[PDB]
Amino acid sequence: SEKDVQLMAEVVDLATGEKQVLNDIRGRYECYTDVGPSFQSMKQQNRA
Amino acid sequence: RGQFDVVRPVVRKLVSEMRQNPIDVLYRPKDGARPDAADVLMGMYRTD
């Protein structure tokens, strides 16, 4: 499910909408939770 | 009625530190957004 440039719709930003919206994975986890330097933007995180 | 007042030279000193370090508006841009509107919002701020 890739990273490569688009060739169907906008797959740059896309997620499951199905034919009716508001559905997502039952097992909600994706990451080890860790805390440290706090930022309020991606841009602020890039600077440091 | 006497006075000594160790109270006020400490309060005077603590205030003078924040006088020489004033804080105004900066408008850093949000997550995934690069600077564009940052000068627009500061443009109206700096004139008035």
Q: How far, in Å, CA of A5 to CA of A2, rounded?
A: 9
CA-closest candidate to residue A39, choices A30, A31, A48: A48
* A44 reaches B (C-beta below 8 A): yes
SS3 content of chain B, % helix, strand, coil (to 5): 50, 0, 50
User: What b-and-e string marks burial along B11-43, b requiring 16 or more CB atoms within 10 Å of the CB?
Assistant: eeeeeeeeeeeeeeeeeebeeeeeeeeeeeeee
- Signed CA dihedral, B37, B29, B34, A4: sign only: negative
CB of B19 closer than 8 Å to CB of A31: no
Report how far Cα B30 is from the mean position of its chain's Cα atoms.
21
B-facing residues of A in 23-42 (CB < 8 A) are 40-42
Question: Which experimental method was this entry solved with?
Answer: cryo-EM
Q: How far, in Å, CA of B31 to CA of B24, rounded?
A: 22
The resolution, in angstroms to one decimal, equals: 10.5
Nearest-by-CA chain A residue for B30: A41
C-alpha distance from A41 to closest chain B C-alpha (Å): 4
Q: Do B28 and A42 touch (CB under 8 A)?
A: no
HSE (CB half, 13 Å, CA atoms) of A21? 2
Q: How far, in Å, CA of B38 to CA of B17, rounded?
A: 29
